[PDB]
Amino acid sequence: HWGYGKHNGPEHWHKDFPIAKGERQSPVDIDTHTAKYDPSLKPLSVSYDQATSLRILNNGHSFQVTFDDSQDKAVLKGGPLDGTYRLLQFHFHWGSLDGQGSEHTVDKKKYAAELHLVHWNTKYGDVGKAVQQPDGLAVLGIFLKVGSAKPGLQKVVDVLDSIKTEGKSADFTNFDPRGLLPESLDYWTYPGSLTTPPLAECVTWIVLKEPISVSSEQVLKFRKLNFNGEGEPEELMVDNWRPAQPLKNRQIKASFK
């Protein structure tokens, strides 16, 4: 089964998921001097005031927080998007060291982690249908750098003890994802894919320019999670990131000059 090890990591995924070598794979390096400013791009509209978080879960490749997506409560619209996209979950990718961990890079610069807020296009009725469509998902990507603590992340950090190993989950209600956003919503956007299997090419990526800062004590709490299930050999959950993929016939657009 796929993972991030020497014998089952990203260089192996194409054997089980041939689309790994496709035409619009993610993540990519964002070359800031060749991205094109597009003044026709609208500002993002993030409406998370009514968000309802449900559960936090160790799925063996990351941890994720899931939201009620049975109504239009927490939605994303605007930017490069047509229509309304509902927030489903968020999760992180992080490194073993502070110099790596993000999936996207900016001028080859790696950040310590990357936050993905996953949304699906309500036109398609359910997330399983949306993953089959070129515009089915919109993932909002936020870089993390190590510096001052982010207070809005601490309630995530404090519960990770209870989901240390694969398959553990816990109630995680009343979490407000607005505490994870930078002050600016300036962004880059390009058409791309899921960065884990099944690697479906169904994603409009929206990558924010402005990182958020997190403290060294916060990020190293991420590094104490396990890939393994309970009662197996311990293998720390670090470096759960896919390296940058060829841009091929794609243009990265910027919302800002």
The C-alpha atoms of residue 103 and residue 121 are separated, in whole angstroms, by: 23
Residue 229 interacting entry, from ligand HZY, Zn ion, none, C-beta within 5 to 8 Å by type: none
Task: Find the part of the chain contacting Zn ion (CB under 5 A) among 4-12, 111-119, 148-156, 232-240.
Answer: 111-119
- Cα–Cα distances (Å) from 127 to 92, 194, 207, in that order, read 20, 13, 21
Residue 194 interacting entry, from Zn ion, ligand HZY, none, C-beta within 5 to 8 Å by type: ligand HZY
Q: Contact between 35 and ligand HZY (CB under 6 A)? A: no
CB nearer ligand HZY, residue 88 or residue 106: 88
- Cα–Cα distances (Å) from 194 to 12, 43, 136, 204, 245, in that order, read 16, 24, 11, 10, 12
Give me the least distance between CB of 10 and Zn ion, in Å please: 13
Which residue ranges make up the annotated binding site for Zn(2+)? 91, 93, 116
Q: Closest Cα to residue 140, out of 208, 88, 81?
A: 208
CB nearer ligand HZY, residue 149 or residue 247: 247
Window 73 to 132, contacts with ligand HZY (CB under 6 A): 88, 116, 118, 127-128, 131
Count of Cβ atoms closer than 10 Å to residue 214 Cβ: 25
Q: Closest Cα to residue 252, out of 29, 20, 77, 22?
A: 29
Q: Active-site residue 61, yes or no?
A: yes
Contact present, 245 and 26 (Cβ < 8 Å): yes
Task: Find the part of the chain contacting Zn ion (CB under 5 A) among 4-12, 15-23, 64-72, 114-122.
Answer: 114-122
Among the listed residues 1, 7, 61, 104, the single catalytic one is: 61
